[PDB]
Amino acid sequence: NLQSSIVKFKKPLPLTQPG
Amino acid sequence: SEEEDKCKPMSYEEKRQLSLDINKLPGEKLGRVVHIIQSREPSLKNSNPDEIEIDFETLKPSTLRELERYVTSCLRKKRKPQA
């Protein structure tokens, strides 16, 4: 409801890559 | 009963601040940030490094506090960790 500061960022080096 | 009693919830202004400090943080430290978020929020395990979303509304005060604790320890000390 309340427009909150939803953040989106790109992180170098995909350490958390699911298999 | 102990956690929230010690760590009070972040207000909107705080959450905006944390959104701003995280944004000032470089890739290196973002690894720790996403680590704190992901490890506190196992539901957010699918945070693809190409598209990591931060939804503070699901983030427990625990995460919000540890995040803030970390971002401040980085930016307050080094406002520019990169040159």
GROMACS .gro file of N, CA and C in nm:
model
  306
    1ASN      N    1   0.084  -0.122   0.000
    1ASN     CA    2   0.000   0.000   0.000
    1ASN      C    3   0.086   0.125   0.000
    2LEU      N    4   0.164   0.144   0.106
    2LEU     CA    5   0.253   0.258   0.115
    2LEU      C    6   0.375   0.237   0.027
    3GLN      N    7   0.395   0.329  -0.067
    3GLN     CA    8   0.509   0.323  -0.157
    3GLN      C    9   0.639   0.339  -0.079
    4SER      N   10   0.704   0.228  -0.051
    4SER     CA   11   0.826   0.229   0.029
    4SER      C   12   0.949   0.220  -0.061
    5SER      N   13   1.065   0.251  -0.004
    5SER     CA   14   1.190   0.252  -0.078
    5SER      C   15   1.238   0.110  -0.108
    6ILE      N   16   1.172   0.046  -0.204
    6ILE     CA   17   1.215  -0.084  -0.251
    6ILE      C   18   1.336  -0.067  -0.342
    7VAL      N   19   1.446  -0.128  -0.304
    7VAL     CA   20   1.572  -0.106  -0.374
    7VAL      C   21   1.603  -0.220  -0.469
    8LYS      N   22   1.673  -0.188  -0.576
    8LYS     CA   23   1.723  -0.288  -0.668
    8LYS      C   24   1.868  -0.255  -0.700
    9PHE      N   25   1.958  -0.351  -0.685
    9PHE     CA   26   2.098  -0.326  -0.715
    9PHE      C   27   2.162  -0.446  -0.783
   10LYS      N   28   2.262  -0.418  -0.864
   10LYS     CA   29   2.339  -0.523  -0.929
   10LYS      C   30   2.466  -0.548  -0.850
   11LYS      N   31   2.495  -0.674  -0.823
   11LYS     CA   32   2.614  -0.707  -0.746
   11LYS      C   33   2.713  -0.783  -0.832
   12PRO      N   34   2.833  -0.726  -0.851
   12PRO     CA   35   2.943  -0.794  -0.920
   12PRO      C   36   2.979  -0.926  -0.852
   13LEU      N   37   3.021  -1.023  -0.933
   13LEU     CA   38   3.061  -1.155  -0.885
   13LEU      C   39   2.942  -1.232  -0.827
   14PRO      N   40   2.878  -1.318  -0.909
   14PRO     CA   41   2.765  -1.399  -0.865
   14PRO      C   42   2.809  -1.515  -0.776
   15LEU      N   43   2.832  -1.484  -0.649
   15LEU     CA   44   2.872  -1.585  -0.551
   15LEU      C   45   2.755  -1.676  -0.518
   16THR      N   46   2.636  -1.617  -0.511
   16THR     CA   47   2.515  -1.692  -0.483
   16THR      C   48   2.442  -1.728  -0.611
   17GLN      N   49   2.495  -1.826  -0.683
   17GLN     CA   50   2.432  -1.875  -0.804
   17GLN      C   51   2.375  -2.014  -0.779
   18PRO      N   52   2.241  -2.026  -0.771
   18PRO     CA   53   2.175  -2.153  -0.741
   18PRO      C   54   2.193  -2.256  -0.852
   19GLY      N   55   2.190  -2.383  -0.814
   19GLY     CA   56   2.205  -2.489  -0.911
   19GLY      C   57   2.080  -2.574  -0.922
   20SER      N   58   1.133  -1.176   2.180
   20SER     CA   59   1.112  -1.109   2.311
   20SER      C   60   1.236  -1.033   2.356
   21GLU      N   61   1.353  -1.078   2.313
   21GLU     CA   62   1.477  -1.010   2.347
   21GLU      C   63   1.524  -0.921   2.233
   22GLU      N   64   1.516  -0.975   2.112
   22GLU     CA   65   1.569  -0.909   1.993
   22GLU      C   66   1.502  -0.774   1.967
   23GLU      N   67   1.370  -0.774   1.957
   23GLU     CA   68   1.296  -0.652   1.923
   23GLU      C   69   1.294  -0.555   2.041
   24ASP      N   70   1.315  -0.609   2.160
   24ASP     CA   71   1.316  -0.529   2.281
   24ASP      C   72   1.447  -0.450   2.289
   25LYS      N   73   1.550  -0.504   2.225
   25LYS     CA   74   1.679  -0.438   2.220
   25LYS      C   75   1.692  -0.357   2.091
   26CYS      N   76   1.649  -0.417   1.981
   26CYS     CA   77   1.656  -0.353   1.850
   26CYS      C   78   1.518  -0.305   1.806
   27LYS      N   79   1.493  -0.175   1.822
   27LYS     CA   80   1.365  -0.117   1.782
   27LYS      C   81   1.358  -0.102   1.630
   28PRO      N   82   1.237  -0.116   1.575
   28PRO     CA   83   1.213  -0.114   1.430
   28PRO      C   84   1.253   0.019   1.366
   29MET      N   85   1.300   0.010   1.243
   29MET     CA   86   1.342   0.128   1.168
   29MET      C   87   1.220   0.199   1.111
   30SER      N   88   1.211   0.329   1.134
   30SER     CA   89   1.102   0.409   1.080
   30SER      C   90   1.122   0.428   0.929
   31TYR      N   91   1.028   0.494   0.862
   31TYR     CA   92   1.039   0.511   0.718
   31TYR      C   93   1.166   0.588   0.684
   32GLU      N   94   1.191   0.697   0.756
   32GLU     CA   95   1.310   0.778   0.736
   32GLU      C   96   1.436   0.693   0.746
   33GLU      N   97   1.439   0.606   0.847
   33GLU     CA   98   1.551   0.515   0.867
   33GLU      C   99   1.567   0.421   0.749
   34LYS      N  100   1.457   0.364   0.705
   34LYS     CA  101   1.458   0.271   0.592
   34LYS      C  102   1.505   0.340   0.464
   35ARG      N  103   1.471   0.468   0.449
   35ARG     CA  104   1.519   0.547   0.337
   35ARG      C  105   1.669   0.570   0.351
   36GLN      N  106   1.712   0.597   0.473
   36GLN     CA  107   1.853   0.618   0.503
   36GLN      C  108   1.932   0.493   0.466
   37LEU      N  109   1.883   0.379   0.512
   37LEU     CA  110   1.946   0.250   0.485
   37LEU      C  111   1.947   0.219   0.335
   38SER      N  112   1.843   0.260   0.266
   38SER     CA  113   1.839   0.248   0.122
   38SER      C  114   1.948   0.334   0.059
   39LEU      N  115   1.976   0.448   0.121
   39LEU     CA  116   2.076   0.540   0.069
   39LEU      C  117   2.218   0.494   0.103
   40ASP      N  118   2.239   0.445   0.225
   40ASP     CA  119   2.371   0.396   0.264
   40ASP      C  120   2.409   0.272   0.184
   41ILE      N  121   2.315   0.179   0.165
   41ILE     CA  122   2.341   0.061   0.084
   41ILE      C  123   2.380   0.101  -0.057
   42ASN      N  124   2.316   0.206  -0.108
   42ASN     CA  125   2.342   0.253  -0.243
   42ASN      C  126   2.480   0.320  -0.253
   43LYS      N  127   2.531   0.369  -0.141
   43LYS     CA  128   2.663   0.431  -0.139
   43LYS      C  129   2.772   0.325  -0.125
   44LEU      N  130   2.730   0.204  -0.090
   44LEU     CA  131   2.823   0.094  -0.071
   44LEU      C  132   2.862   0.032  -0.205
   45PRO      N  133   2.991   0.001  -0.220
   45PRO     CA  134   3.045  -0.060  -0.342
   45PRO      C  135   3.022  -0.211  -0.349
   46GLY      N  136   3.055  -0.270  -0.464
   46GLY     CA  137   3.029  -0.412  -0.486
   46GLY      C  138   3.081  -0.502  -0.375
   47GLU      N  139   3.204  -0.475  -0.330
   47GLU     CA  140   3.268  -0.554  -0.225
   47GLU      C  141   3.177  -0.569  -0.104
   48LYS      N  142   3.137  -0.456  -0.050
   48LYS     CA  143   3.060  -0.454   0.073
   48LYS      C  144   2.916  -0.497   0.048
   49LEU      N  145   2.869  -0.479  -0.075
   49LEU     CA  146   2.735  -0.524  -0.112
   49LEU      C  147   2.724  -0.675  -0.095
   50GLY      N  148   2.838  -0.744  -0.107
   50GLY     CA  149   2.842  -0.887  -0.085
   50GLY      C  150   2.807  -0.923   0.057
   51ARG      N  151   2.850  -0.841   0.152
   51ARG     CA  152   2.818  -0.864   0.291
   51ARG      C  153   2.673  -0.824   0.319
   52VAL      N  154   2.629  -0.716   0.256
   52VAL     CA  155   2.492  -0.669   0.270
   52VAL      C  156   2.393  -0.776   0.226
   53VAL      N  157   2.410  -0.825   0.103
   53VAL     CA  158   2.322  -0.928   0.050
   53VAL      C  159   2.335  -1.056   0.132
   54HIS      N  160   2.452  -1.077   0.190
   54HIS     CA  161   2.475  -1.193   0.275
   54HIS      C  162   2.392  -1.182   0.403
   55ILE      N  163   2.387  -1.063   0.461
   55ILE     CA  164   2.308  -1.039   0.579
   55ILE      C  165   2.160  -1.052   0.547
   56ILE      N  166   2.118  -0.990   0.437
   56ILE     CA  167   1.980  -0.998   0.393
   56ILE      C  168   1.940  -1.143   0.366
   57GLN      N  169   2.016  -1.209   0.279
   57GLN     CA  170   1.985  -1.345   0.239
   57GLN      C  171   1.988  -1.443   0.358
   58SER      N  172   2.085  -1.427   0.446
   58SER     CA  173   2.102  -1.521   0.557
   58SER      C  174   1.995  -1.499   0.665
   59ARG      N  175   1.948  -1.376   0.680
   59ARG     CA  176   1.839  -1.350   0.772
   59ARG      C  177   1.706  -1.381   0.707
   60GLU      N  178   1.701  -1.368   0.576
   60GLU     CA  179   1.579  -1.392   0.501
   60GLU      C  180   1.597  -1.511   0.406
   61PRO      N  181   1.581  -1.635   0.454
   61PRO     CA  182   1.600  -1.755   0.371
   61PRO      C  183   1.500  -1.764   0.256
   62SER      N  184   1.393  -1.686   0.265
   62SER     CA  185   1.294  -1.681   0.158
   62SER      C  186   1.349  -1.603   0.039
   63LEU      N  187   1.448  -1.519   0.066
   63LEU     CA  188   1.508  -1.436  -0.037
   63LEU      C  189   1.635  -1.502  -0.090
   64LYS      N  190   1.641  -1.634  -0.080
   64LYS     CA  191   1.757  -1.710  -0.126
   64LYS      C  192   1.777  -1.694  -0.277
   65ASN      N  193   1.668  -1.664  -0.347
   65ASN     CA  194   1.671  -1.648  -0.492
   65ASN      C  195   1.702  -1.504  -0.532
   66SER      N  196   1.788  -1.439  -0.456
   66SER     CA  197   1.833  -1.305  -0.491
   66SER      C  198   1.941  -1.313  -0.597
   67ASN      N  199   1.898  -1.313  -0.723
   67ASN     CA  200   1.989  -1.317  -0.836
   67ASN      C  201   2.076  -1.193  -0.836
   68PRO      N  202   2.209  -1.212  -0.838
   68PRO     CA  203   2.307  -1.102  -0.835
   68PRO      C  204   2.285  -0.996  -0.944
   69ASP      N  205   2.217  -1.035  -1.053
   69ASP     CA  206   2.183  -0.941  -1.159
   69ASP      C  207   2.062  -0.855  -1.121
   70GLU      N  208   1.980  -0.903  -1.028
   70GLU     CA  209   1.856  -0.835  -0.991
   70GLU      C  210   1.824  -0.859  -0.843
   71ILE      N  211   1.900  -0.796  -0.754
   71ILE     CA  212   1.873  -0.809  -0.612
   71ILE      C  213   1.778  -0.701  -0.565
   72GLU      N  214   1.666  -0.743  -0.508
   72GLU     CA  215   1.567  -0.650  -0.456
   72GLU      C  216   1.583  -0.639  -0.305
   73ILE      N  217   1.568  -0.519  -0.252
   73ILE     CA  218   1.565  -0.501  -0.109
   73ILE      C  219   1.426  -0.455  -0.067
   74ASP      N  220   1.352  -0.544  -0.004
   74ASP     CA  221   1.221  -0.511   0.048
   74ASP      C  222   1.224  -0.510   0.200
   75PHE      N  223   1.249  -0.390   0.254
   75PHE     CA  224   1.267  -0.370   0.397
   75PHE      C  225   1.142  -0.408   0.476
   76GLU      N  226   1.030  -0.421   0.408
   76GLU     CA  227   0.903  -0.446   0.474
   76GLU      C  228   0.893  -0.590   0.522
   77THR      N  229   0.970  -0.679   0.462
   77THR     CA  230   0.975  -0.817   0.507
   77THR      C  231   1.095  -0.837   0.599
   78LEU      N  232   1.197  -0.754   0.578
   78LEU     CA  233   1.318  -0.757   0.661
   78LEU      C  234   1.283  -0.734   0.807
   79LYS      N  235   1.322  -0.828   0.892
   79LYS     CA  236   1.304  -0.815   1.036
   79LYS      C  237   1.395  -0.704   1.090
   80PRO      N  238   1.356  -0.634   1.199
   80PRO     CA  239   1.444  -0.537   1.266
   80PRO      C  240   1.585  -0.591   1.288
   81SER      N  241   1.595  -0.723   1.305
   81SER     CA  242   1.723  -0.790   1.319
   81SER      C  243   1.813  -0.759   1.200
   82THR      N  244   1.763  -0.788   1.080
   82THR     CA  245   1.836  -0.765   0.957
   82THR      C  246   1.862  -0.617   0.938
   83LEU      N  247   1.758  -0.537   0.959
   83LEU     CA  248   1.767  -0.394   0.942
   83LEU      C  249   1.874  -0.334   1.034
   84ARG      N  250   1.885  -0.388   1.155
   84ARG     CA  251   1.983  -0.340   1.251
   84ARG      C  252   2.124  -0.385   1.211
   85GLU      N  253   2.139  -0.511   1.173
   85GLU     CA  254   2.271  -0.562   1.135
   85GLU      C  255   2.320  -0.495   1.007
   86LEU      N  256   2.227  -0.472   0.915
   86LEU     CA  257   2.257  -0.400   0.792
   86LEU      C  258   2.306  -0.260   0.824
   87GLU      N  259   2.225  -0.184   0.896
   87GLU     CA  260   2.260  -0.048   0.935
   87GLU      C  261   2.394  -0.045   1.009
   88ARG      N  262   2.414  -0.142   1.098
   88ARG     CA  263   2.538  -0.153   1.175
   88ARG      C  264   2.658  -0.167   1.082
   89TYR      N  265   2.638  -0.238   0.973
   89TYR     CA  266   2.745  -0.267   0.880
   89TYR      C  267   2.768  -0.152   0.782
   90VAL      N  268   2.660  -0.099   0.726
   90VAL     CA  269   2.671   0.008   0.627
   90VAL      C  270   2.735   0.132   0.689
   91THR      N  271   2.702   0.157   0.815
   91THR     CA  272   2.756   0.271   0.886
   91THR      C  273   2.903   0.250   0.916
   92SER      N  274   2.938   0.128   0.955
   92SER     CA  275   3.077   0.096   0.986
   92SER      C  276   3.164   0.109   0.861
   93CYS      N  277   3.102   0.101   0.744
   93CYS     CA  278   3.176   0.115   0.620
   93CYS      C  279   3.179   0.261   0.575
   94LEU      N  280   3.062   0.323   0.564
   94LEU     CA  281   3.051   0.457   0.506
   94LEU      C  282   3.092   0.568   0.602
   95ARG      N  283   3.061   0.552   0.730
   95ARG     CA  284   3.098   0.653   0.828
   95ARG      C  285   3.249   0.658   0.844
   96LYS      N  286   3.312   0.543   0.826
   96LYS     CA  287   3.457   0.532   0.833
   96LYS      C  288   3.518   0.570   0.698
   97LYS      N  289   3.465   0.510   0.592
   97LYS     CA  290   3.513   0.536   0.457
   97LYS      C  291   3.395   0.572   0.367
   98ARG      N  292   3.374   0.702   0.347
   98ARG     CA  293   3.265   0.749   0.262
   98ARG      C  294   3.289   0.711   0.116
   99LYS      N  295   3.415   0.686   0.083
   99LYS     CA  296   3.453   0.640  -0.049
   99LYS      C  297   3.552   0.524  -0.037
  100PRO      N  298   3.501   0.401  -0.023
  100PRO     CA  299   3.585   0.281  -0.015
  100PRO      C  300   3.655   0.251  -0.147
  101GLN      N  301   3.611   0.319  -0.252
  101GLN     CA  302   3.676   0.311  -0.382
  101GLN      C  303   3.729   0.448  -0.420
  102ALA      N  304   3.824   0.452  -0.512
  102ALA     CA  305   3.885   0.577  -0.551
  102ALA      C  306   3.872   0.600  -0.701
   0.00000   0.00000   0.00000
